[PDB]
From a paper:
Trypanosoma cruzi, the protozoan parasite causing Chagas disease, encodes a miniature MscS ortholog (TcMscS) critical for parasite development and infectivity.
The full-length TcMscS, consisting of 165 amino acids, was heterologously expressed in Pichia pastoris, purified to homogeneity in glyco-diosgenin (GDN) detergents, and subjected to single-particle cryo-EM analysis. The 3D reconstruction reached an overall resolution of 3.21 Å with applied C7 symmetry. The C-terminal region, including amino acids 138–165, was not resolved in the cryo-EM density map and thus not included in the atomic model. Comparison of the pore profiles of TcMscS and closed and open EcMscS channels indicates that the transmembrane region of TcMscS has an intermediate opening, with the narrowest pore diameter of 10.8 Å at residue F64. The structures of TcMscS in detergents and in nanodiscs are essentially identical, with an RMSD of ~ 0.3 Å for all Cα atoms. Thus, this conformation is inherently favored by the purified wild-type TcMscS channel, either in detergent or lipid environment. Therefore, it appears that the resident pore lipids occlude ion conduction, and that channel activation would require departure of the pore lipids from the central ion permeation path.
Author numbering:
A (entry chain D), B (entry chain E), C (entry chain F), D (entry chain G), E (entry chain A), F (entry chain B), ...: 1 to 137
């Protein structure tokens, strides 16, 4: 199932990094196999309610802890092909005092990289770029 | 079921982009078929509680990760036909220091495009336009 | 059931726009019929748990995506007959830097329209009007 | 049951407006009768799970949409008999730039009315009055 | 059970006002009796699922509406015996522009009362006092 | 079970105050005994669903009301042994206008005590210290 | 199971501190053993619903109390190998008035340590570093 999940992720373009793709495929295959095993165990008579409750609590806690990571990942997925965030573009994110200006040099799954006028590297989170006023110059 | 969902989305006007319409139709058809298959499996005696719990946890996590995307999409759906956000209109979004001014050039499902006095392109999120004071001039 | 829901909405005054009333009546009739059909299917032995879980997840996601729309609609419903927001009244919403001033020209289910001293049209969301200090002059 | 709910609301002082009291009594009687009918239907064998799920989803959505209305109503209920918010009192709500000053002229279930030095009428929400620094002069 | 709940509340010091103690005892006794009655009804065969769902929805809505009241009550309970908030003490709550200064004159279950240099009475919510920088002078 | 819970809390270092330790041990023993009694009652045939629903609603409301207290307690637990917050250290919490400066004199489970240059005592909540920029001098 | 969990945590790199690794292994082994014991008890006929409800409520309350700790831990896990946060690097976190500048001296699982121009030690939370504009110089 790992190969199937890797193929699905590669085809859909959700995940592009090979290491991240392998990790996600392993995790998804393990989760699906565990769910199938729990269903099979519950079919024959074993009470799966405590196991389901514990697994659900652990999964909810883990997903709530990784909220920012997930949000940044989704923002990076959505913003792809924006036609305004490209290499060499002079973009400006923010309005008012909280303003960020620079030239796009690289894009990541967690940060958007800009080069300032003084040569500094600016790490703008993708979630910040999503919920802000991007100014293309 | 893909054709039925595509027809429903096209008729209701919820989704207009053909690629987005096809993707949404495929996803909805797959989800409905999976729910029907799970119900059929649970009818004959298979314990579907672990599968339901896992699918619900995954769906909740995915929907919570795409919160901003969904909010922007809904805002773009609602704001359609505003009679104030039209091509060539001089609108101004915001009050105080966080102010954005320009002329509407194009509308998207994720951003509202304005042209500044200096010629810059402003990408205002639809969610920002919804919960703000739009000033038509 | 569509006619019954339309009559109920018209009598209670919750919805006034005929197009919105027809859409809401259709949606409510479809939802009630679907719930009745699911109950009937579950009576005869079909396991309705996966269908209920899927429908609940979809409904929760849709309702959470339309949070701002629902809030604005409820605010417009509540603020009706305020005796202070009337045509020709000089109202002022907000305190401090985030201040909005104008004369009320029209009311909508999504925006409150004011005319500035310079002639601009101000679109103040109803949710903003609810949770703010309205200053009648 | 409408008369019983009206008597309970009048005696407890939760609701004072006769129209609001009648509406709340009707709604509560209808809800209790519906719950009793659903329990009776489920006793004889009818699967009430889809109906319960649909009713719960609708009630949760409605209650979440009316969050601000409910909060203001509860604040108005709690603040009653404050001994500081009385007719003719010179109160001041807020600290810093977001300050509101005036003389109390009337109290409502949604707004607190103050008269400014220039004669303007200030509509301060009860929720704002609850979570703020009231300054009695 | 009303007397038992009154004794428990008085001994634990959670509630000190006799009227509030009587109201809380009545409410708790009614709730416990209702839960016992529902359990007894469900034992003999009556389907209690709709009643439980309705009661839970109503209780959740009521508890969410009284969020600020509950938070202030808990803050007043916790802050008791602070050794810094005493009669005649010159305390200062807040940092920056949102600053409040005065001498403590009285304590309530909803507000903390201070006397300003000009003689004004300041009503500082207990929740504000909890999540702020108290400056004892 | 009270002695067992007291020993566990003392060994793990979660709770250090003897009065708080005794109260927590009593509460935990009562809760565990109640859960065991409810399970035993449900084994013999008594429908425990209404009792479970009522207890869960009450516990959720209580835990949500004590959110700030719990957060401060957890922050005090985590920050222990920081090697930067010690007696006599000149620390500075905050950035910008909301800045607090002083010398650490004492630590509590609810506040962090600092002595200002003018001799005032500053009560900084532990939750504030956790989510802020501490500046050791 | 403690050794298995320790090996898993060490191999995945989620936890690096040996004391934290041992504590997490003990906690995970205890939780899994408890879930298995509850499932076994529920298989033979014992009603595990009250125990599951109590354990779930306690776990939810504990996880919600440790929200900031979990968020900081996840941020520290994610930010590892940033290639911009290294020893001796001159980084600047924040935009506007809330700005922090210094040279990285050490990294922790709860704070990021910077040395100011005046020699002060700055404790920047990892969650703050995640959701901010890092400026590498």
């Amino acid at each position: 199932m790992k190969r199937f999940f890797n193929r699905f992720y590669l085809d859909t373009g959700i995940i592009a990094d090979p290491s991240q793709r392998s990790l996600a495929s392993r995790v998804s295959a393990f989760l699906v196999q565990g769910a199938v095993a729990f269903s099979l165990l519950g079919t024959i008579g074993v009470d799966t309610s405590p196991l389901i409750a514990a697994a659900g609590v652990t999964g909810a806690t883990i997903g709530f802890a990784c909220k920012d990571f997930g949000t940044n990942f989704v923002a990076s997925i959505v913003l792809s092909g924006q036609q305004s965030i490209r290499t060499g573009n002079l973009v400006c994110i923010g309005t008012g005092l909280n303003v960020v200006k620079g030239k796009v040099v690289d894009w990541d799954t967690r940060y958007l990289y800009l080069r300032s006028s003084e040569g500094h590297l600016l790490h703008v989170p993708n979630n910040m770029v999503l919920n802000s006023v991007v100014t293309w110059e």
